[PDB]
């Protein structure tokens, strides 16, 4: 649907809180998610003749978008492969789809991380926006222990209107991000 | 059948399956099966969604358990880096901490034989 929980939560709960905390004059000054770009590194797939198109069609279930097939820009003998035919797997989420993804991630996925004490509170640093990376991709509901074969982690960058990480920290913590105080 | 975090037994008699947890052996296993009142001869294959939750209830709530059990012992070995007790060292030199003969074996605490030697006797 064109409406989801978090989306509602943002408007009818967080929006105001922030206007009250930091005293914004204009609706637009009030920070808002921009996007959540998620990406997998994949140092293999190159070699062992590995098609490994297993990861995108899989990823597509969790993110809800067919991911995009990213490739190496230099040649590195040291670290293998030569520009081009190379490997990496990246998807960009905005609007509803962005929301549905975070909804599930926060409300479900981070729960069944192996350890967990909260998300690292040093991954904005002024440079608004927040990064974190994961190890197991089966922590999401859609992924099952049957489906897996290799445990491919991922990086999650989440980008915002906030120009300082003060006001960005608030936004995420209030949207339901558990931070490791 | 993922009771403890990254841990999932299957298609084996549950009694020993539960062994396949760090922090759970034959003892804490049988102990839990009577208290949940379930036949251990039965497999993880087959059971009610109720049986499953009933089991993970009792277990995960009682004691601990991979992760923060594992993380706990470490902090205890860590604390033996106080001013530095005897058990503190031996942990510092990776040697037997429990009063043994280093002169010969100890290989379990010492990675396989670093033969490294060049001793001499008479040439002329």
């Amino acid at each position: 649907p064109l409406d989801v929980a978090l989306k509602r939560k943002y408007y009818e709960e967080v929006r105001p809180e922030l206007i009250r905390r930091f005293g914004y004059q204009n609706v637009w000054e009030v920070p808002r998610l921009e996007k959540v770009v998620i990406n997998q590194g994949l140092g293999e797939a190159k070699e062992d003749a590995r098609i490994l198109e297993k990861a995108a069609q899989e990823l597509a279930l969790i993110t809800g978008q067919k991911p995009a097939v990213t490739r190496a820009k230099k040649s590195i003998s040291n670290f293998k492969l030569r520009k081009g035919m190379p490997i990496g797997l990246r998807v960009t989420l905005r609007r509803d789809r962005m929301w549905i993804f975070l909804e599930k991630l926060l409300n479900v996925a981070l729960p069944r991380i192996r350890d967990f004490r909260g998300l690292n509170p040093n991954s904005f640093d002024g440079r608004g926006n927040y990064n974190l990376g994961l190890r197991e991709q089966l922590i999401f509901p859609e992924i099952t222990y049957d489906m897996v074969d290799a445990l491919r982690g991922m990086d999650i960058a989440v980008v915002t209107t906030a120009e300082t990480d003060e006001e960005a920290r608030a936004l995420l913590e209030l949207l339901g991000f558990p931070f490791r105080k | 059948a993922r009771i403890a975090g990254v841990e999932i037994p299957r298609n084996k008699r549950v009694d020993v399956a539960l062994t396949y947890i760090y922090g759970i052996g034959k003892a804490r296993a049988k102990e839990a099966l009577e208290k949940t009142g379930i036949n251990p001869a039965t497999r993880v294959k087959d059971l009610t969604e109720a049986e499953v939750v009933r089991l993970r209830e009792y277990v995960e709530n009682t004691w601990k358990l991979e992760g923060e059990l594992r993380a706990e012992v470490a902090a205890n070995i860590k604390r033996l880096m106080d001013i530095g007790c005897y058990r503190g060292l031996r942990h510092r030199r990776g040697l037997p901490v429990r009063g043994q003969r280093t002169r010969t074996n100890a290989r379990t605490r010492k990675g396989p034989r670093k033969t490294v030697a060049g001793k001499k006797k008479a040439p002329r």
């Binding site: 989801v4 909804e103 409300n107 | -």
Partner: peptide, 30 residues
């Protein structure tokens, strides 16, 4: 498509995903 998550912590959440059939071993209520 619209989905229905089911916790072992009783709780049912209403998001949307691929396949509504969802067995969760506890959400962020625990």
């Amino acid at each position: 498509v619209p989905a229905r998550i089911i916790c072992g912590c009783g709780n049912v959440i209403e998001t949307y995903s691929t396949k509504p059939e969802i067995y969760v071993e506890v959400c962020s209520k625990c």
